[PDB]
Design a protein around this ligand. Structure first.
Ligand SMILES: Nc1nc2c(ncn2[C@@H]2O[C@H](COP(=O)(O)OP(=O)(O)NP(=O)(O)O)[C@@H](O)[C@H]2O)c(=O)[nH]1
Ligand SMILES: [Ca+2]
Ligand SMILES: [Ca+2]
Ligand SMILES: [Ca+2]
Ligand SMILES: [Mg+2]
Ligand SMILES: [Mg+2]
Length: 166
């Protein structure tokens, strides 16, 4: 069957692991344990297609920034995550995109921009600001909450639908 190699990237603490774990394991991780690099694999049906999601959950802490080159090489699509209550994490997105662009030698890499923690009201990134960033990259913007499950499946399935357009 078709395997989709997804890679989740973004600054530390934005909810990359919580999003991935909610998708794959259907619970919310409340505590914060920083990730080095973890892999999840699950068979799912997306738009009638039985397929395998292979998801790489990467480190946001800059201590592990040297590992980015490797994982950006193997990935077929990238979930670029920031948190809507973390302006710096939104600003950081360009550096993740620019590296993906450089490593893939393409500005048509399948990606989705994800604004996580949308259950929180301490919003400093307005939806329209993120819509505009995603538009500049030619990709969709989706808001999610790993806590409530809002948008979680949608974000990952949307990334699969972007890979299929490549
Ligand atoms: N309210 C709320 N908290 C969230 C959400 N997603 C993650 N968190 C919280 O934010 C913290 C960091 O989440 P985590 O998934 O570990 O972040 P990360 O992006 O994987 N971090 P790292 O890059 O260091 O591995 C955790 O306490 C987690 O419960 C969300 O959608 N809503
Ligand atoms: Ca494949
Ligand atoms: Ca929990
Ligand atoms: Ca692009
Ligand atoms: Mg993590
Ligand atoms: Mg503002």
């Amino acid at each position: 069957m078709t395997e989709y190699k997804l890679v989740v990237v973004g600054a530390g603490g934005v909810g990359k692991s919580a999003l991935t774990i909610q998708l794959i394991q259907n619970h919310f991780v409340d505590e914060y344990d920083p990730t080095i690099e973890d892999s999840y694999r699950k068979q799912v049906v997306i738009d009638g297609e039985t397929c395998l999601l292979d998801i790489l959950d990467t480190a946001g802490l800059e201590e592990y920034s040297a590992m980015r080159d490797q994982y950006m090489r193997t990935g077929e699509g990238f979930l670029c995550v920031f948190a809507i209550n973390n302006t710096k994490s939104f600003e950081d997105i360009h550096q993740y995109r620019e590296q993906i662009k450089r490593v893939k030698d393409s500005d048509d890499v399948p990606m989705v921009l994800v604004g996580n923690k949308c259950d929180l009201a301490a919003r400093t990134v307005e939806s329209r600001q993120a819509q505009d960033l995603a538009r500049s990259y030619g990709i969709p913007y989706i808001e999610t909450s790993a806590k409530t499950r809002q948008g979680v499946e949608d974000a990952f399935y949307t990334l699969v639908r972007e890979i299929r357009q490549h």
